[PDB]
Amino acid sequence: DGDAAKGEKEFNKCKACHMIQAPDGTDIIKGGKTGPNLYGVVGRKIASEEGFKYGEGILEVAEKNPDLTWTEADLIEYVTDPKPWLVKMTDDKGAKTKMTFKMGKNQADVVAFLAQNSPDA
Numbered sequence: 001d002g003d004a005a006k007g008e009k010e011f012n013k014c015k016a017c018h019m020i021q022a023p024d025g026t027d028i029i030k031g032g033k034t035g036p037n038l039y040g041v042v043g044r045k046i047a048s049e050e051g052f053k054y055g056e057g058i059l060e061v062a063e064k065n066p067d068l069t070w071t072e073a074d075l076i077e078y079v080t081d082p083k084p085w086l087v088k089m090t091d092d093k094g095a096k097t098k099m100t101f102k103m104g105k106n107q108a109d110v111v112a113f114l115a116q117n118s119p120d121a
């Protein structure tokens with residue numbers, strides 16, 4: 001029951017490292033490039049952005065769970081704190097994350113907005 005409208009505002013916390021750009025190159029939310037493009041993230045295979053240099057931990061999660069694609073629930077869990085999520089999914093205490101940013105509240109709203117921007121999910 002996240003609110004995508006509120007989620008768009010919440011996205012201001014993410015924009016410094018992530019943009020939302022359509023495959024055609026259309027900017028939905030102009031943002032940085034430290035992190036991968038979030039357009040179509042819902043339903044997308046974990047760490048699958050082309051040309052994006054992902055960290056070791058998330059690549060390990062993809063490798064270990066090949067069929068894993070991001071679901072809204074997983075996304076909410078991950079943005080809460082990537083660290084523990086990665087430890088959980090890799091069973092590796094030392095799992096490294098390139099994303100240290102944590103979102104302790106309003107996770108569902110931001111996820112709802114990501115979903116709005118994952119039209120073909």
Ligand code: HEC
Nearest residue numbers: 013014017034035036046047054055058097098099101103
């Ligand atoms: C704002 C609340 C957000 C949200 C919703 C997301 N991020 Fe980030 N992010 C950053 C980096 C360097 C990465 C790559 C991580 C790595 O390799 O370990 C990510 C990755 C993500 C994902 C995974 C994307 C995938 O393709 O699988 C998701 C869903 C995600 N982020 C959401 C870096 C940053 C930041 C840099 C300082 C900031 C701020 C954010 N992220 C913010 C958010």
